[PDB]
Swiss-Prot record, chain A:
Effect caused by changing A13V: In strain: Beta/B.1.351, Iota/B.1.526
Organism: Severe acute respiratory syndrome coronavirus 2 (2019-nCoV)
Lineage summary: Viruses, Riboviria, Orthornavirae, Pisuviricota, Pisoniviricetes
Glycan attachment positions: N21, N29
Parent-protein start and end of this portion: 689 to 728 of 1273
Function: Precursor of the fusion protein processed in the biosynthesis of the S protein and the formation of virus particle. Mediates fusion of the virion and cellular membranes by functioning as a class I viral fusion protein. Contains two viral fusion peptides that are unmasked after cleavage. The S2/S2' cleavage occurs during virus entry at the cell membrane by host TMPRSS2 or during endocytosis by host CSTL.
Name recorded for this polypeptide: Spike protein S2
Length: 40, 23
């Protein structure tokens, strides 16, 4: 059932933002995220 | 910003001037 397909590239999730003059968000938990970056 | 025969082609960018505006 497989095939090769062509499409417009999704630049990201269409993400909605909870703005208000009186609203906020602040975090309570976090990842100490490790990344590799590699250079000649 | 103002702007053929002998084997010469100007290929398109991967990202259109419109998708630049999306990012
Ligand atoms: C905050 O926004 C609401 C509309 O969403 C408005 O009625 C309210 O007066 C605003 N408050 C302040 C302090 O700007």
């Amino acid at each position: 059932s497989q095939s090769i397909i062509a499409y417009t590239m999704s630049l990201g999730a269409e993400n909605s933002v909870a703005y208000s003059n009186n609203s906020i968000a602040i975090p309570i938990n976090f990842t100490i995220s490790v990344t590799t970056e590699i250079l000649p | 910003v103002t702007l053929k025969f002998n084997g010469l082609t100007v290929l398109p960018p991967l990202l259109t001037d419109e998708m630049i505006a999306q990012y």
